[PDB]
Amino acid sequence: QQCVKLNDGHFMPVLGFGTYAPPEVPRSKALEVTKLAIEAGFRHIDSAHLYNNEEQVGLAIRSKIADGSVKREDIFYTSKLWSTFHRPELVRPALENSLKKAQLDYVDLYLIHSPMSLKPGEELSPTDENGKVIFDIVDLCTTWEAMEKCKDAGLAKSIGVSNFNRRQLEMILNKPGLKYKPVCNQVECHPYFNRSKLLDFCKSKDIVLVAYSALGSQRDKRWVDPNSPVLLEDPVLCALAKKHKRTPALIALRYQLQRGVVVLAKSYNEQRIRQNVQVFEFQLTAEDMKAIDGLDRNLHYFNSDSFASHPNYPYSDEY
Numbered sequence: 001q002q003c004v005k006l007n008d009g010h011f012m013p014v015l016g017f018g019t020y021a022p023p024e025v026p027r028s029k030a031l032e033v034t035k036l037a038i039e040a041g042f043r044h045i046d047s048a049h050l051y052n053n054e055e056q057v058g059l060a061i062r063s064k065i066a067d068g069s070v071k072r073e074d075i076f077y078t079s080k081l082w083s084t085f086h087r088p089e090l091v092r093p094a095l096e097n098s099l100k101k102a103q104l105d106y107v108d109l110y111l112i113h114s115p116m117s118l119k120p121g122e123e124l125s126p127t128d129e130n131g132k133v134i135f136d137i138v139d140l141c142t143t144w145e146a147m148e149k150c151k152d153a154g155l156a157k158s159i160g161v162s163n164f165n166r167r168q169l170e171m172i173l174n175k176p177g178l179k180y181k182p183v184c185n186q187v188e189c190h191p192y193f194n195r196s197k198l199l200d201f202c203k204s205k206d207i208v209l210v211a212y213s214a215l216g217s218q219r220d221k222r223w224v225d226p227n228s229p230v231l232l233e234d235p236v237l238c239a240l241a242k243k244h245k246r247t248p249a250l251i252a253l254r255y256q257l258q259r260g261v262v263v264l265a266k267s268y269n270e271q272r273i274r275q276n277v278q279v280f281e282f283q284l285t286a287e288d289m290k291a292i293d294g295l296d297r298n299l300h301y302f303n304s305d306s307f308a309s310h311p312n313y314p315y316s317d318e319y
């Protein structure tokens, strides 16, 4: 499918498959749907250590390779370094563990999952005696130096960041002796939070903005306010769907593609997985795009209020 050339020289498919499913979903499902996604045409697959599914996603990939559906070089697999492994010496070992889990020799993209460092350890969510998550203080530039070492070691073809604001990205870009710029910044991006300012900045530095929750999130009552507006039920998106004879999801996805944003799309439903690849079958008019541009309400679906006190909380800046 369509790809975008990274400041790396490497290529990333502009459409990616989101693999996160809540803990209640059996892990066998991740294996099943990833195969369905590859069969549908998805070549870009987004995972992470935190998802507790890299083994299943890797198994699916190995399966589609074995049956001759695809070759490893045809698949773009990404993993993410969790915040409890920000200390430089824990980076490569974290990547190696993901590689071992997924039964892969390398990941096409490794990202620092979030700039908000947490206390080092196996536990992904460390909390103190009063039930509060334990933060850690780490110079992300040293974490980045460790990431660069992983790319030089061939373990990651490309390296990037996730959930970084302009200031945090600049910290890396301005780091003395910088070897590799992040190829991307994966952030929450959709019509209710389009990130136009950050997008423009990223474009100026040749960094790709990858959109997550591009379809409005999974809206789990544990992290998403039920009163928050349902994206796929937006009057404007629905109007454009009926006009183009597509669906609101396809409209939201096409919007990103036309503004130069790589879009992720999660679905554990075979029919919807197959529908999502149809985003390349139609185009939105310039007027359609302006209409969607006006939907922005700076709405972040995930309730990150508990991290508001973190020195690296990214949402303090205007962008």
Ligand SMILES: NC(=O)C1=CN([C@@H]2O[C@H](COP(=O)(O)OP(=O)(O)OC[C@H]3O[C@@H](n4cnc5c(N)ncnc54)[C@H](OP(=O)(O)O)[C@@H]3O)[C@@H](O)[C@H]2O)C=CC1
Pocket: 017, 018, 019, 020, 021, 046, 047, 113, 162, 163, 186, 211, 212, 213, 214, 215, 216, 217, 218, 232, 247, 249, 250, 264, 265, 266, 267, 268, 269, 272, 273, 275, 276
């Ligand atoms: N780095 C980071 O901080 C983060 C990264 N991510 C990554 O990006 C992805 C972002 O997606 P996420 O927030 O999970 O969810 P999305 O916003 O992609 O979810 C869309 C939701 O809509 C449904 N859906 C999918 N296709 C359609 C369709 N055609 N029509 C109607 N409904 C549809 C899905 O449900 P159903 O399964 O029932 O189809 C899915 O739950 C994740 O899976 C993950 O890989 C996500 C959050 C944070």
Ligand SMILES: C[C@@H]1O[C@@H](OC[C@H]2O[C@@H](Oc3c(-c4ccc(O)c(O)c4)oc4cc(O)cc(O)c4c3=O)[C@H](O)[C@@H](O)[C@@H]2O)[C@H](O)[C@H](O)[C@H]1O
Pocket: 020, 021, 022, 023, 048, 050, 114, 125, 163, 188, 218, 219, 220, 222, 223, 302, 303, 304, 307
């Ligand atoms: C600051 C926050 O950091 C990240 O969430 C951090 C939280 O993730 C939670 O991990 C979860 C994630 C998640 C997180 C990151 C991802 O990349 C991702 O794809 C998914 O997604 C869910 C989606 C659901 O529908 C239901 C859920 O219970 C969870 C969930 O617990 C952990 O359980 C918490 O302990 C942790 O603090 C995300 O980037 C989020 O969008 C951002 O706002």
